[PDB]
Amino acid sequence: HQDNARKSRIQSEHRELVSAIQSYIGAQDDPTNPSEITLAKLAPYMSKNAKNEDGIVNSLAKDKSGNSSTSAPGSAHQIDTTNHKLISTFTPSNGGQATVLTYDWSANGVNSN
Structure with missing residues (x-):
């Protein structure tokens, strides 16, 4: 079930998190090479339904086990x-490979096309 859902349920917010990455990074001490970005960090930069770290991450897709070390508190996003x-790291209830929705900020190649 989540095999198809992972795509959609994450996709909705996935865009949001990266919309926040572009916000976080553009705010950083150095946008050229910012630190590790998480949902709990992206909280202030979210234009999407979010307020603080408790707000954002709870408002975002949540993974089941956290066995992927997603950094995002119970959330299906890890940059x-x-x-x-x-x-966007979805650690399934199956314990199998986590589901991912990816966006490239640096796009080290052919502009992610």
């Missing part, structure tokens, strides 16, 4: 700092 991608 990759290596390439600087907005990943």
